[model samples]
Target: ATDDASVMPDISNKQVLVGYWHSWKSSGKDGYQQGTSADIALKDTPKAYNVVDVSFMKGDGVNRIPTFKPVGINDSDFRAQVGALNKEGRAVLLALGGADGHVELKAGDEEAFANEIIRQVETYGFDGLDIDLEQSAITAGDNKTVIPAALKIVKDHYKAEGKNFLITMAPEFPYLKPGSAYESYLTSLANYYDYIAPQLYNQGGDGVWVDETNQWIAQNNDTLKESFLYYMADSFINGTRGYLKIPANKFVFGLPANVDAAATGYVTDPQIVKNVFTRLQAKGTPVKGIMTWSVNWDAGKNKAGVPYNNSFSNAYGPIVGTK
Candidate 1:
């Protein structure tokens, strides 16, 4: 088999930086509270993101049918901006399920569910889909679960139509750690994915471990902070090396966009974020790029004059451009 870094050729040359555009929150907020109301249009979203996963497309609660319409955007405005973003070389994808979303795909629901996913892709002019099915949606089944099977059908259909349909997943860190809940599922469906961005924040512990004293280090810890970030990237790149088996080119390192974007695991220092990328690149694992929890939370300027929404991108943009 080829080495892990050479798996996906399409994204091999360029960094795959992802920004999640939240549908619900338009205005920027402080702490963890939802952002206040504002007439945010899709056209107004920043262009720095290589891939923008539109926040959520929820299930109907009865059947696992996907439903979505960004809160303030009408069909005309949404389509116009999707076309604009596409023209600018950004892949805009529809994200399915969220923390509170309930989606369950029964055994026979694969084909219909795949069709519904395709319909949404066509209707909204989306470039692809991001499966963010968490909680029960992931742990409710055995290795023979229908979610991956359904997604395979979707992948095949997109291929048949001669489309470069991107399929990505956003599982949390624990679920992807060895022997965790969705390990089997992730390993089984590895080939069908174009990008696998595991959420690295909110685990309430040190990010990962090191070998000197066999001690675990927190990402935000001041001492040896760069090493902590390096270990975090190494754990995902090397930790899932055997099982998920995705190339470094397809591995998008995920973290919160701003301090208030998440309760824990937010990286306030852009240099620390860039250091993680630099360390990974030096180790021969030039990762695809970075992915933040959201763009909405990163939208406005802070007291420090930093643009919360694009902080990560601004810091890493020059680095990716040179690579």
Candidate 2:
């Protein structure tokens, strides 16, 4: 219903720019390569997409160990690429601390890390910070404590220095699958985060049969709507007063960019995308945008038919922009 250039006035509070990182394995091969998707996404639907979320993984070393930064994301190139998006009125966020079994940030060093975040905003010209820390007992009993503290530190630092920064969190949906829920966890930090998104893929694991997937969507339609609405309501209830504070337009709904359904215990069907989109539209609930795991995974499939690139078009449904 909305064209690429026209921002959804009703949802101008936020726009979901679906994106993923291009990764490389230690073996010198693609780590879920989706370079093609990234290229096409950048070229074709510039204004349609908002907030490109990029992740950087640091290996298990004392110092910052770089594992996979995109091939051409140096300062100059990164600035140009991000600047191009910004010119189109889009936002770019860098996600730190991911699920690669590495990249951990704890409670004690929150301020020091927040300072680095400020430096990054100055250096890379980022609009905000995305915390993608997973729940790992070995890492921390619960990230809720440290994550909120870190976000507050960044928010305060940026404010004192006369900068407005966005703070978002990537949460996993519980109803989608057994161990993949975030209602309780997210509700705990609802006040602190600018926006939050639950990773909706692999919701049912191997149980993602076609009929089951549809049933899940249908069954949870009201619940999903309530979740988004309630998250915004809760933020306000907690008294974090600000424009972007309530997360109405920015409450993103995510989908996988590329899925090796066979390996990930999920299905990759374009029709599913349509079905989900249709359901959301019918509810009149603002769908900020869609996000996928990584770009590299959607690049192409391997000889065994496993998906390799995490592109929007690679989805089982029609490409979001094409239709």
Candidate 3:
């Protein structure tokens, strides 16, 4: 089998980078945080973003149906932007759930859940869906079963319509490490997904645990140690140390775009990221790519220009472009 497990080569090759676009205001989920960031419009997404997933949709607790609406712009304009990006060969997907969201895809609502998402994809012109469900949603009783069943239905619907519907997931890092998977979400849903981009930041005491060092190389403090990042990536590539065994071809390294974007784990120096990329390539791992926490935060800055300008994309974009 080929090492490139990317389902949408036209939209995003294995070398392409992905970023998340916010559906909320400059102020974050609580409405008071991140007030300094520019309110980015969907149509005005930066040039460095190769693929984008728009976050997020609120799930109706009873029906398990998720709804997405354009917050700052009209639905028509949002659709226009999705169409424009599609024409440019960029995959704009709908992301369900976030840290603040509660998406309970209960056991019995698989068909209803998939149908509404299908309706949403048609209405918004989304290329596919990304499951970013967090908190208890990750371990909900039926997520492993209901989520995979619904996603398979969604994929089948689009395939009949002659489209490639990309399916991806962004689980927190803890669930992916050795002896993780409290609910077997990744193991059960692996076949239905195109890429597995685990969130590798904002997690406390979470990083690649090295067998050789007999130490925990945490995300924030020790990310730059020469051998630190390499071992972390190798854990994903080879499933070393009993980590989950997903193909490297469908794995996307994910991180926070800037310091304020996450509670912890932002790379002050991006050279190490490039170094890890080179090492992974040398090992013949057809890594899917890198995914940052946000597009707004990449371009965000306080009065002191804390985050710098598009630091995430400007630093990581050239690596993918050169590939």
Candidate 4:
């Protein structure tokens, strides 16, 4: 559509270290999280993060149309920054929808919906798109077909020009678990996806569903410790959760970078990341890698309570990106 070239990531598949670059200048205004800090440039995100997804592509209320614009940087400047990251073999993906942002790709308007997303991809020179649709947006399920079809268009467009486009999802824990209402969203999009990074934070004790006890385990539970992560990874990737299955090589664990980054499920011990990796590696798959909520918080100085620390990225990078 434009004269510019699309820049993609060097490494497309497993062992990814990802961070969501917040679109807000400081803390979120709604107060689900209280951490406050200045915005961070794409170039300044931690070296450990090989894939950086912008916080959101917004919309109105329900039946909202996809609308994306750079939050801090101007159009050309943002594109150049994306270009810079792509040159470094780091991927900068445009994330669609948020916990609060309601994005609706309607039934009769699939063509227009797909075109608008593609236009943004072309305009921003983004390496790919990250589907972070949650809550009412996902349950509506209009996105299930429209999103995958649009992403497929993105992937094929790049292929013709000799570049690759990555497609990923950041659905919440409960939705994608087997027999859950949002189960079909994962299964339908499986063949078209590069990998899936389910949000493992903010679920408040809903770490993963276990068939052994036919109950849910909390990630922060003291007794189980990192087994919460172990089961989460296994259940999704190994088909242990019964019907829902996402292959191990294409799965990444998404966590919070700081204590304030999420309400719950922030890995207090960096060692837990190592333990999970080692345990999962023993299964012969070794997984993809880890993804954190926001890079800004990881690099934040905390203008509020529980001072933000870059502990998560610093400690877990080598552990996940090593191979």
Instruction: Write candidate 2's Cα lDDT for 196-224 as tens digits.
Output: 66565543421111231243231123334
Q: State which candidate, 2 or 3, has the greater TM-score.
A: 3
Q: After superposition, which runs of candidate 1 have C-alpha atoms over 4 Å from their true positions?
A: 1-12, 25-30, 33-39, 141-144, 219-224, 240-246, 301-309
Write candidate 1's Cα lDDT for 1-323 as tens digits.
22221111144356777878878854444446443222345666666667788878877677555578766667656766777777666778888788777676666777777787777666667877788876677764331366677678877876786666778888776666667667766676777778788787776664565775487676456565567666655666666322334467778777877666776776656777677777777888887777887766666555454545456666656656621
lDDT of each: 0.67, 0.48, 0.73, 0.75
Per-residue alpha-carbon lDDT of candidate 3 for residues 194-248, written as tens digits (9 for 90 to 100): 8888787777666666778787787766544446556766786777764677687
TM-score of 1: 0.84
Return the clash pairs for model 4, or none. 15-288
Q: Count the backbone clashes (under 3 Å) in each candidate.
A: 2, 23, 0, 1
TM-score of 3: 0.89
State how far residue 58 of model 1 sits from its true place (Å). Answer: 1.3
Q: Estimate each model's TM-score.
A: 0.84, 0.63, 0.89, 0.89
Between candidates 1 and 2, name the one with more favorable TM-score: 1
Q: Worst lDDT window (10 residues) for model 1?
A: 1-10
For model 4, what is the error of residue 13's alpha carbon versus the real structure, in angstroms, after optimal superposition? 5.3
